[PDB]
Symmetry: D2
Subunit: 466 residues, 4 copies
């Protein structure tokens, strides 16, 4: 495992403490053995997400201080429009309060736009993998969300360069099966979050776009982690070995028609989202019409001016290769610590999170007893670290049958915020999980004390099986 | 006209400049004679809105600096929950990125809640007056938005204590006409924005709530300007002459079951919103399920932690009577300056804006030529002040026929941000409009150069009728 | 009286409250009837100084946020050096923690430099009027402080353009009496603070510098309020009628060899100072040698990097003519309010403060009973406004006899911070003092309850004589 | 070598970059091979000092934001006064702009007070070791500064618990030789800076104070690094093994009569200083009289209110054992990396810096050619790290002879700022120096290109002898 030194220094700190074992036991009991119900004061290191918890630079805060809060025509709106033109070569922008706000703006408009001439009768969206909220807005608008990630992503511990790739064969298959008139849009997710933050290759993005243009299908780039995807393209594609990150980004967005972005991820913000449209002025006008009642007026879109200001600066900082090398390297360092201790992970590590295969850690716990959640709770009790379950607990029940949906994998996700924790915090996490190895065989599963009908993993209360 | 001195002093300033006469003329032409298309850099004093442009206190900024950005269980979420319990005596909160986000969370849930028992087949919402975004979400969910403000509000220049009151007779009539089973909810807007920021009396809120309870109807308090309403209740109701503002507020919310709030208004923020529910845990659970895809996880609701932190402090500051007396006194001062100069306005002035009857200023400009918009453009060209039209330009076309709906009044709204402008800025606005008297008779109407199908007053380009 | 509108709007506020009559009485009694002993929490509007109480801009705060805190070679040090070259055309800078820190750096160095040839055995400094701390450092190094302001400043109520002028006759007289060998330096104070903030004309500065060069005397520009002086020169000298403020500034500093500056005044800061030297590299080197033990290392000079950053931005903002017109106009407005009510003041008002002649308001109070202080205390009890005494209380006792020194004038100084208070705050001050007119004949003087030997006006406790 | 995890996470970052070797070669050559002349933009990691470069907490920034800038009676002055009473049990405080400002306030007052009683005819100061500015102010007032650190501090690599201790025998000898009437004050420096950040034991502080009280000598605690001293006392003295840091601090100040403190060190500030006096009201009054012309009025002392606010918060954070354990442990880790590679250092590492004996790394470079400066320059060219020389270059020439004084040790000081750099930055520093092992034998000395008469090490320009 190799540590990469920060290309920055610390300007401001925030205190975090390890509560005593007695407090953690009491807190987890109060949270119903569900860390999503823990208060942040009960948490030492928070690995729940990489969304909105990043550390900003002094330049970002300075931009916020001089932010323009005007209701219409904020100076920062035009800066943001110019920045999108510089980075992506797209001519239209609509700010949003965050990524799912951007999806709520654009996706219903794409459905209306596809239907306007009498198409989209059995409408579908096709993606390498839809993110959870992305797929939710697809389904809330009466559409089917189809995921066709490459098969290389399902062999978790076997290395591959582009585990986020579309399966090109399955893409052509779905176009023939559903017809180009029913495909509202193709969503290229970069990096592919649901495959574990694994990159999509430039040639895969190019081929997907060429297929979409011959069939007249609109392409949306889900761009939450477009800078981590660009770093991987430079690191693993020989064509871009000597390109700048910005040059990689510019080529990526030749292969889409628009983008939805959570600025809470790679742009290094705590809040914020963005819709950008390449050149389709009609979709831009329709998305503006939906933005006003849903998010706010079209020159701030549910963002404070100071947050559009921070987004302009963060979009620049998020492309800096030295930071990307350190950031993605820190995630790799945590993964390499676990792998060298025999802990099975998804390999290679993605850009923002390490995924630990808990099924191999607690084999005595069946899937319907949430093995990954048992390891997560054990991890919290031992260390104060809070992680999140990507497995049977998250997957939920089948709506028609009421049965536990089958999970292929029982993952514990260790999601790493940007510029927040040191490699010593990474060592603290690894040494905490490694120290559970003799106790894994003794862990018991979990059963429900309270289970809501939908979105159970957020608020359900569990209890240990004794 | 009486000036009220600030109960604060200035800690930080932001530079604004008056562009030269030619720069203002060039900018207005570039904006297509629509000030909504102006960049903020072409504006000296901005009166477009009182939303999100407020000046925070140093205590609010300090609260942001120590804000807890945690994804789940942020310390500021629990503070905000305690504050809602303190001010409103409500047990449940869901933060939202702003006011229309709060409505998108709650209003579709109230409909599904009403429809689940097999009724609400022709559902309606009843309000003293729906705000634009409120009515939009009502109609987007297939419901009719019914407005029943007291008739005293339509006599613009005639004083009344409570021009925002419900018409009780019309409320009982609509309950009988549609049936209590089709009324999803009653929305009490305080102050009543569309009546001009005019207050609702405590007895009116009480009678509305009592009528709604006799029919089992849910009551939502639209609370964007609830602190200005409480001040008016203390100023004009002898029952509360010796009550604190918080005591009036506490009584107000005995007459609702929940609230939606734009914190970009009276809570003195630049962004932020809030749903609070009194005690109906089922509606709270359903609104949380919708919050997740639409706004974010339920402990931040599309807000940065720092913005929840500022909201806790701003909710306190927004109730301070000395500030409220100054704020509303500054609005009254601008109105009295114009009224004493013979400019006809809505009287008494509301809590947040002055409305100027422009047809009496430019009678040679008929309503279909947008007389209020012509007055606004002239005000901009003389002074750099940007105001907004509440008249025929705003009212728009009938969607079925495509014809210009005619507005009964042609208002220019001078909307005043909180703690931003001095009474010297108020004199500058008044003196500019008063100085326009000899040029009012020479003003020309306006016609469309480009008219979009939707968002007409926002983006349409106009041209002078030569 | 004419109010001038702010060329800015408020971005952040700070709460101030008027304590009740009983609280003010208790606080003043607890402070021993000396407002210098009051805590700020007992003060509504603070008129004690215009030093370090200014409101900064958002650009100044943004500059602090990215300030470079490096011990040696801070980016902000070089920015400050370039700014001094741009404004003053001086080649060397040494930051200081504030103005008296800069005087402590330079004045002992100028004395040692003058002494190097065996002269200056009876050394003096000559100024139009030494500021208190300036005169203090002159005497701390064993020198005599000579003040020779024009006779026009002693006739308080008669208008003159340049009441801060040197008496050229007295300059040539003092040079002949003491000899150019004993004149360590001439200090040109702009504006002349002790004459009431009154400006020095360009021709007076030019004549003083030419007289000094023919005798080989060093000229130091005390530059605390150099921007207010430049505004007056443009306002009252037809030669500069069409010059920019920076052009006036540039000419002003052709007539000095170095400057000491408190940035807590015109550069709009809360802390900070500056020494700048035209081209004498020898004096610059000696001043650097003294800076290290007294203030800090020479690239920060007892300042935080963020404070050098704020000074660079504040030096720019302090020269803006629109701001200078508003600022000085607010001081004139306060003066005109009082003058139009029959309150005697020094006229015309200077750049930063109004001086009220209290001997004419309470003639029944002899000087040794502190008439101006009696008016100040009464003003505080009536309004919560805190002012400062420039009279017999400040002048102190004769060191030779121990008898009360005779004061020519008994002034109450109303010192106005920059961009902090509105003209409504000015009305509040004026109306409180005007409302005291019927009580002035009833006021009683003060005598000492506790008197320290030196600097009594800061900490002496007084009691009413009755 | 053991890494200790941060008891905090990063809230804001500051960009630093490693210039290429060609840029460093150009930058070092441009700076005349003296890193003190380098701009900070040429520096990646800055190890010049630990003064004023610390990273504040979000609570410290929030305290600044609500800081009270009042000229007299700032809320933060009284908070600071209460804090000094809480921590040290001292009843009087005088803020100062930084540590040498505090010494300029107090030390001339102690001399005048001693002379007022007919003593201090041949005045001296005695310390375990005077800091540079401390001794400078002693000599500026005509006194001799006597250093009597224990002999254990001169044995560089031999461990001892208390290498900052006073030599009691030399203390009693100096009292007899000079007489107690000539001892103006004893300065107890904690930690002992000039011994390398080495602690003073509680019993040593106690015995020194008891000796001083028997002779009527005033004791001043130079308290720049009093919290690092307190941690060492808890870490190494079994009597305080179970005491809190504050309890250790509270006992320490029973053994002094006053303190001078640079808050730019352990109180975690970028600027600021403090005088506190235990109970001698006369010394307090005299120090206030000197404070006014030298620093400012007595309720801010040359500090902005925001900086007194940060100092209150920083004094608390600086005492937190979890932070102190991490801070001092990070310094120990850098030392342990070097020791494990065979690099000779002073052992044990002090609280704030690592000292590398460069004579043993480059024995071919004699003392008059500055061997440590040669290692520093090579270290900068290899890595962008800037360190400072404590050897012949700093020691200077003998004033009587003008030849280079012989230095006992040629140290390179690696001074570590607080909460700024990670242990990965420590590895980067160590790995850079360790990678120089093959280049050490080839290194050439340095000779003067330009040498100033005083304080040459700040501004002298060197050239490689080759
Ligand atoms: K966040
Ligand atoms: K805003
Ligand atoms: K100040
Ligand atoms: K500093």
């Amino acid at each position: 495992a190799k540590r990469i030194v920060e290309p920055f220094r610390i300007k401001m700190v925030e205190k975090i403490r390890v509560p005593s074992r007695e407090e953690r036991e009491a807190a987890l009991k109060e949270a119903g053995y569900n860390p999503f119900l823990l208060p942040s004061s009960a948490v030492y290191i928070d690995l729940l997400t990489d969304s909105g918890t990043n550390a900003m630079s002094d330049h970002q805060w300075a931009a916020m201080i001089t932010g323009d809060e005007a209701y219409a025509g904020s100076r920062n709106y035009y800066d943001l429009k110019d920045k999108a033109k510089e980075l992506f070569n797209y001519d239209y922008i609509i700010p949003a309060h965050q990524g799912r706000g951007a999806e709520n703006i654009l996706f219903p408009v794409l459905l209306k736009y596809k239907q306007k001439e009498g198409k989209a009768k059995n409408p579908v969206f096709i993606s390498n993998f839809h993110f959870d909220t992305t797929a939710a807005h697809v389904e809330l608008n009466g559409c089917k969300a189809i995921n066709i990630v490459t098969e290389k992503a399902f062999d978790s511990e076997t290395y591959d360069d582009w585990k986020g790739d579309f399966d090109i064969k399955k893409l052509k298959e779905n176009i023939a099966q559903h017809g180009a008139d029913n495909i509202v849009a193709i969503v290229s997710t970069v990096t592919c979050n649901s495959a574990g933050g694994q990159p999509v290759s430039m040639s895969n993005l190019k081929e997907v776009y060429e297929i979409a243009k011959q069939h007249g299908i609109f392409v949306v780039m889900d761009s939450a982690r477009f800078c981590e995807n660009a770093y991987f393209i430079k690191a693993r594609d020989p064509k871009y070995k000597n390109a700048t990150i910005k040059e990689v980004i510019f080529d990526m967005y030749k292969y889409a028609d628009a983008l939805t972005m959570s600025a809470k991820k790679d742009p290094l913000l705590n809040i914020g989202g963005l819709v950008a449209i390449r050149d389709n002025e009609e979709i831009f006008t329709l998305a503006r019409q939906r933005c006003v009642p849903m998010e706010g007026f079209v020159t701030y879109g549910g963002l404070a001016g100071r947050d559009m200001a921070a987004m302009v600066q963060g979009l620049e900082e998020g492309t800096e290769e030295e930071y990307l090398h350190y950031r993605i390297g820190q995630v790799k360092y945590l993964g390499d610590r676990l792998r060298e201790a025999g802990i099975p992970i998804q390999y290679p590590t993605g850009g923002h999170a390490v995924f630990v295969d808990c099924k191999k850690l607690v084999p005595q716990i069946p899937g319907d007893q949430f093995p990954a959640q048992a390891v997560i709770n054990a991890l919290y009790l031992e260390s104060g670290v809070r992680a999140v379950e990507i497995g049977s607990f998250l997957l939920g029940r089948d709506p028609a049958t009421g049965e536990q949906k089958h999970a292929d994998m029982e993952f514990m996700r260790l999601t790493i915020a940007r510029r927040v924790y040191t490699n010593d915090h990474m060592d603290y996490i690894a040494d905490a999980l490694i120290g559970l190895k003799e106790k894994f065989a003794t862990l018991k599963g979990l059963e429900f004390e309270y289970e809501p009908p939908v979105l159970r993993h957020f608020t359900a209360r569990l209890k240990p099986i004794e």
